[PDB]
Design a protein around this ligand. Structure first.
Ligand SMILES: O=P(O)(O)OC[C@H]1O[C@](O)(CO)[C@@H](O)[C@@H]1O
Ligand SMILES: O=P(O)(O)OC[C@H]1O[C@](O)(CO)[C@@H](O)[C@@H]1O
Ligand SMILES: [Cl-]
Ligand SMILES: [Cl-]
Lengths: 550, 550
């Protein structure tokens, strides 16, 4: 049980409402730098990773000062962020609505600390599956695991959706510099048949390995897609006994895996207490281990592990994911900003925002607290983004000159995996990273617009308000370890947010209605008889489809 | 000059504020269907394309009725949406801040109507460039245009960013079913050197064609990327005279094209009155013409042309892009929703939301009206999305159970280009399209949660508010013509929004400050001396980078 019902009940929440009116709403970042010559030092933190690599988190261009952050910290203490965190790490069933542990932290327990669920250490069982993942990925990569005609595997297709897809996609894209030429990964996720047809078009069944990734192993799209891949494989291979060399499963559900015709020796298991949107660390990351090798995958886990130890052991006021979460609440609940922009100045990280969208929004898009009452305040933010410099030429116009507050996180690596032309492109990329946050803060007033040459009614069109907040995250390099630490940062930021809002960040009851309603309609699409069983819009859309379908 | 200063000054705006309080804020869609047995018929419209194909636009699950829509129409009339539209089509300089025509409509004038800028018909000059595009793309595709060693082209790389990139990417992805095996398109856009290195990795200079796409032909990232591709080509080809077989330009700026070492015969020109985010219809779409053939590209243009004729000639109250724009304003300015979700139930359309993000947000992210005063009300929405069914497993949890209003557009084709398994996947995909909008509208109350088996404090966690609005857009098939009509729909929706807000949807002054600030910093990154020329955050970030860079 929670210690409180609603976040709005916490005494510091009421205090922050007043602080918002007196100091927050008209906060001047320019004035803050001028008041405090140590602002950068006070509002930036160096994270040191397990391998002594570093990441600078600079919050100093945010609409925050010591007064405000101290209050947000007091709010975090009243909301029991620490008690909930420690319960999570203790293996307690803090996913209250499903009565489950929340133990993604245990997936990357490479130190083999004691980490019990139901009073039973999980360290060894997690480790065993990783050992299996190492053996199998090494086999694929060295060419000793051969297909049904005795050939080495050249292509691996992950089939899965949401938590079983976005992670493998994002991380294989992000760490693509660590891949081996000739060993390619592919993804089928959408039920849209285009996805199957386009992905299998040029693949050879003799040298293609499928990974069927589903926590439940009952997701409608995934089982259907896996059946279609099995059909495609057998159209060439003919005999079902060959499936054992070409189909593995990443799942919690051994029963359904085996019922599907996948051998238990080819299952890479995980438990219920791994949420899908926190599963890349598990068996789900097998595609990653194959693409870039197990040791790199282990390094990614150990980056998460080090950020977990940071989150667990650091006082709130210096606790980097906590500070990120506190600013989010500040913007979401006091300013009323609805969005949170995440912009990697990194092409490899192009699918990093899409990944964070699930982690953040599926966790925190809730309307009911742990005391089982409805919120009377905003919960999860809408998270979006694209890589820079692309994003500068898409929607940054609105970020600079629009009417909406859009808290933004910019991410850059100091070193590129691709330092072509003796780093000409890298320095240009970096210059944009620095200048965009600079621009958003400093703006450009009327006087400067006039000095730069505009007259009359053109003048206001060229003004920049400035005072637009950013968080800058500078890594040395986007290694596996760095990426693991960065994801864990957003995981614990997400944690802090949900803890303050007193929501359950770890369930997803909101997907069930669409699932049940789609099955009903799917049966109705088995003929071309007009339907009148729904609302008139749903009926009209279905009936128009029936007239227009093949 | 504008007829009014601020949208908030229009008498109907003030009326709508009252209508919002009395009827809008607590609007019940369920009650609306029960009051009006003809609601679906009254709030849905069939668009008929030039080829007699059709698209159903169903607005009936929105928070609107006849009273509200009539008021929004009166607002559109007070704001002079029609006068501004007709000025645009007349070739008038409605891009007031740059004193330019806004004439993307003239790019797809395949009927060769008289469409003058500065009193001079553009029909023939636009047509001439399309004839050049047809000849050249036919040459590439039939193999008669050979590289410097006499081989046919196998790969085409578009180099360009923002308006010069997102369109080519989105449309080649969307219409990929119409492509030819062995003739591939690639994109370099980011200045991040990863983008160049990864794209050119496996290409052969002897059979690779570059399209340097830049309206200005001065964009820093694009010229740098084009120089790098020219370096890569010449590392193999050795002699600069071979460039003429491997480099074309899509630009307004012949001077800079020629200074770059591209031959004028290999330039595909367009004019200043084509905004980048409305340029795919121009020479910029050359990659599309090569990928799927000129005739398919012409069909795409003629789809835009037909939607333009719809927009131009239809009374507001039946004018489909107008209705979409009016609902946007309703949600943005009366409910205070900050976002607009666009979800294609279509894998090919995976980059359709990212494209719309520029069109919408770069157009409408403005704070200054055509009367040259600052707005005191919300302008552009934050547009985001991913394809379904993927999006259902990412952030739809928040769309169903979060605390934010998120107006959503769902798009489905009744027929797939990939109807595998006698349409098993297609019917499943469609069932999700229908069920998601159904679910968002109908919700699930306390009583039903109890009937379905929940007790005690679990009950509220499983409730769905419902009354969550969607627009459903059902096409027969995503042909070129359909896609052209769909983009033009968002273009004219964007138009309507900007017209009501009295902003200039056609400039982008907001990108200049970041550009100027990045050049300053770029010069500072040419050494490793600490810098103190900026704010302390910008200085600290730069200095940390200098310590950590290669
Ligand atoms: O891994 P599974 O069980 O196929 O589920 C896929 C996804 O669908 C959800 O259950 C519902 O969105 C996600 O949380 C999950 O990641
Ligand atoms: O086509 P160009 O001139 O290289 O410009 C690229 C993009 O950058 C902008 O000028 C600024 O974002 C866009 O409007 C444009 O599409
Ligand atoms: Cl603002
Ligand atoms: Cl709501």
């Amino acid at each position: 049980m929670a210690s409180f019902k609603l976040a709005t009940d916490l005494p510091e929440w009421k205090k922050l409402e007043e602080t918002y009116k007196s100091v927050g709403e008209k906060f001047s970042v320019r004035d803050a730098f001028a008041k405090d010559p140590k602002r950068f030092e006070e509002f930036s933190w160096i994270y040191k990773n397990y391998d002594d690599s570093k990441i600078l988190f600079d919050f100093s261009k945010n609409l925050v000062n010591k007064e405000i952050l101290d209050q947000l910290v007091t709010l975090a203490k009243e909301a029991g962020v620490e008690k909930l965190r420690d319960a999570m790490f203790a293996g307690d069933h803090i996913n209250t609505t499903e009565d489950r542990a929340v133990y993604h932290v245990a997936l990357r327990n490479r130190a083999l600390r004691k980490m019990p669920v139901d009073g039973k250490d999980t360290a060894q069982e997690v480790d065993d599956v990783l050992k299996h993942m190492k053996e199998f990925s090494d086999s694929i990569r060295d060419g000793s695991w051969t297909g049904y005609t005795g050939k080495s595997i050249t292509d691996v297709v992950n089939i899965g959706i949401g938590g079983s897809d976005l992670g493998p996609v994002m991380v294989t894209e992000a760490l693509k510099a660590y891949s081996k030429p000739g060993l390619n990964v592919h993804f089928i996720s959408n039920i849209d048949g285009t996805h199957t047809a386009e992905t299998l078009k040029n693949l050879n069944p003799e040298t293609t390995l499928f990974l069927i990734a589903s926590k439940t192993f009952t997701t409608a799209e995934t089982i259907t897609n896996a059946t279609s891949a099995k059909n495609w494989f057998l159209a060439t291979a003919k005999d079902s006994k060959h499936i054992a060399k070409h189909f593995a499963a990443l799942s919690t559900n051994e029963k359904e895996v085996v019922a599907f015709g996948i051998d238990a020796k080819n299952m890479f298991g995980f438990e219920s207490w791994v949420g899908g949107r926190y599963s890349v660390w598990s068996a789900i990351g097998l595609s990653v281990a194959i693409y870039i090798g197990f040791e790199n995958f282990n390094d990614f886990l150990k980056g998460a592990e080090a950020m977990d130890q940071h989150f667990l052991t650091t006082p709130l006021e210096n606790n980097i994911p906590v500070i990120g979460g506190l600013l989010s609440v500040w913007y979401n609940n006091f300013f009323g900003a609805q969005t949170h922009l995440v912009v990697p100045f990194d092409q490899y990280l192009h699918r990093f925002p899409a990944y964070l969208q699930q982690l953040s929004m599926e966790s925190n898009g809730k309307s009911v607290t742990r005391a089982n009452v409805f919120t009377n305040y905003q919960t999860g933010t809408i998270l979006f983004g694209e890589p820079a410099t692309n994003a500068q030429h898409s929607f940054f116009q609105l970020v600079h000159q629009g009417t909406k507050l859009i808290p933004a996180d910019f991410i850059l690596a100091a070193q590129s995996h691709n330092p072509i032309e003796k780093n000409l492109h890298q320095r240009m990329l970096a210059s944009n990273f620095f200048a965009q946050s600079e621009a958003l803060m400093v703006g450009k007033d009327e006087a400067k617009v006039k000095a730069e040459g505009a007259t009359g009614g053109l003048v206001p069109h060229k003004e920049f308000s400035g005072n637009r907040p950013t968080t800058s995250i500078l890594a040395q390099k986007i290694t596996p370890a760095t990426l693991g630490s960065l994801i864990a940062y957003y995981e614990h930021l997400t944690f802090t947010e949900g803890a303050i809002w007193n929501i359950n960040s770890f369930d997803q009851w909101g997907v069930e209605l669409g699932k049940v309603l789609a099955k009903v309609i799917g049966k109705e699409l088995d003929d071309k008889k007009a339907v009148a069983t729904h609302d008139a819009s749903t009926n009209g859309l279905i009936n128009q489809f029936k007239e227009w379908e093949e």
